Amino acid sequence: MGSMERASLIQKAKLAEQAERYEDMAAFMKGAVEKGEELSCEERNLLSVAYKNVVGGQRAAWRVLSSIEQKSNGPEVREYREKVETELQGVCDTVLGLLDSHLIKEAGDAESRVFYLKMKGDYYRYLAEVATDKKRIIDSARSAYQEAMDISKKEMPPTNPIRLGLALNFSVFHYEIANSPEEAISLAKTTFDEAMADLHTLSEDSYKDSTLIMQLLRDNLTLWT
């Protein structure tokens, strides 16, 4: 995407989202990141939405194929699950590479740095879902989430939607990846309760944003308890 203007890549990413063309969206946003400038808040969201949709479809397909493979236990189901798995790992490696070159190191503000570290934890978590260096991948996810948590607790109010989404995803990591359901439940509860106590400070629009993510925390707590 080296010959396209940064602003044109961003515009095309927005069009790709409207057209539900998420692979295109991700390629446009990768091109925008590779221009070397920092990303605005809206541009970070475009980057995250694009890759979340791409890897979300891969993960859903991997789960279908892994279930068929486990039920069967010819080489075709394993071969095809392996093909999807390799593609998924390639997308995660691409996102992690963008974060490492050089989005995180240039992110000084808490909002941007927490956003990228949450992404780093998420994409290591997706790698962990298919891994069997499994321990090192899990530790990489945990380390990224933990640094994001530490910054968010110092620099952001408890209702900040990025802080809330980070805590939600880290709790999912604890429950689904790290075999730590009690840590997952504790984190979700503490996060919910501290956000509840801070809602009084918010405008109607911010209240809507924060309460929507609190409902996701409550939905997980209901499923886990």
Binding site: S48, V49, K52, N53, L168, N169, D219, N220, W224
Partner: peptide
């Protein structure tokens, strides 16, 4: 369970 959906 559920992570942040992402739009």
């Amino acid at each position: 369970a559920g992570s942040i959906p992402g739009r």
